[PDB]
Amino acid sequence: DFKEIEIILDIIKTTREIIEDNDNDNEKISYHRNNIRKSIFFLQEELLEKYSETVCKYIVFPLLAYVDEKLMLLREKSASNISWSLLQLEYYDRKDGGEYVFEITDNILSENIYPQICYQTISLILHNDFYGKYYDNIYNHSFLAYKKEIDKHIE
Ligand SMILES: [Au+]
Ligand SMILES: [Au+]
Ligand SMILES: [Au+]
Ligand SMILES: [Au+]
Ligand SMILES: [Au+]
Ligand SMILES: [Au+]
Ligand code: NA
């Protein structure tokens, strides 16, 4: 089953709401960042009961990277001068998640059969327009391969 996917969907949902919204001050964004941080901890808690560290990483990191990408987009477009500190820096001291999502994805596809939740999580971020290093090239053949390939792992 999963209380996990319910948390993941909710993180995704609330993020999409933030971008769609016309006016956010830094207050609201901040409030949103902290709610995601609360959720991540419950997400990790639920994961570490059943799964390896590496598997939690494979699931949490892409989620953080999804959120950072979209908030970084909003922050750039935004009239208001809103600020965003990278979650992927906060949890993992790296900022190259535009790439790292795809190394995780490649591992998930090449290196083993991991629990289904790893495939679902990448799938979900991709079905929500996470581009990472392909932001300029939506039709990059590797990028399209990733989409087709992870989806062939789910029901
Ligand atoms: Au964890
Ligand atoms: Au495979
Ligand atoms: Au989709
Ligand atoms: Au799809
Ligand atoms: Au190919
Ligand atoms: Au699979
Ligand atoms: Na730093």
The CATH number that applies at residue 81 is 1.25.40.590
What is the domain range of residue 117? 1-155
The experimental technique used to determine this model is X-ray
81: left (phi over 0), alpha (psi -120 to 50) or beta: beta
> In 10 A of CB 108, how many CB atoms?
23
Encoded tokens for 72:
């970084």
Dist. CA 127 → ligand 3 center (Å): 4
Resolution expressed in Å: 2.5
Yes or no: say if 40 and 47 are a contact pair by the CB < 8 Å rule.
no
Dist. CA 127 → ligand 4 center (Å): 6
Dist. CA 121 → ligand 4 center (Å): 12
What residues does the ion ligand 6 have nearby, CB within 5 Å? 153
Q: Which ligand is nearest to the CA of 50?
A: 1
**Secondary structure (DSSP) of the chain:** --HHHHHHHHHHHHHHHHHH-S---HHHHHHHHHHHHHHHHHHHHHHHTTS-HHHHHHHHHHHHHHHHHHHHHHHHH-SS------HHHHHHS---HHHHHHHHHHHHHHT----HHHHHHHHHHHTTT--GGGTT-TT-HHHHHHHHHHHTT--
Q: Which ligand is nearest to the CA of 112?
A: 2
Distance CA(60)–CA(4), nearest Å, equals 11
Distance CA(126)–CA(94), nearest Å, equals 21
Number of domains in the chain: 1
Q: Which ligand is nearest to the CA of 154?
A: 6
Q: Which ligand is nearest to the CA of 86?
A: 7
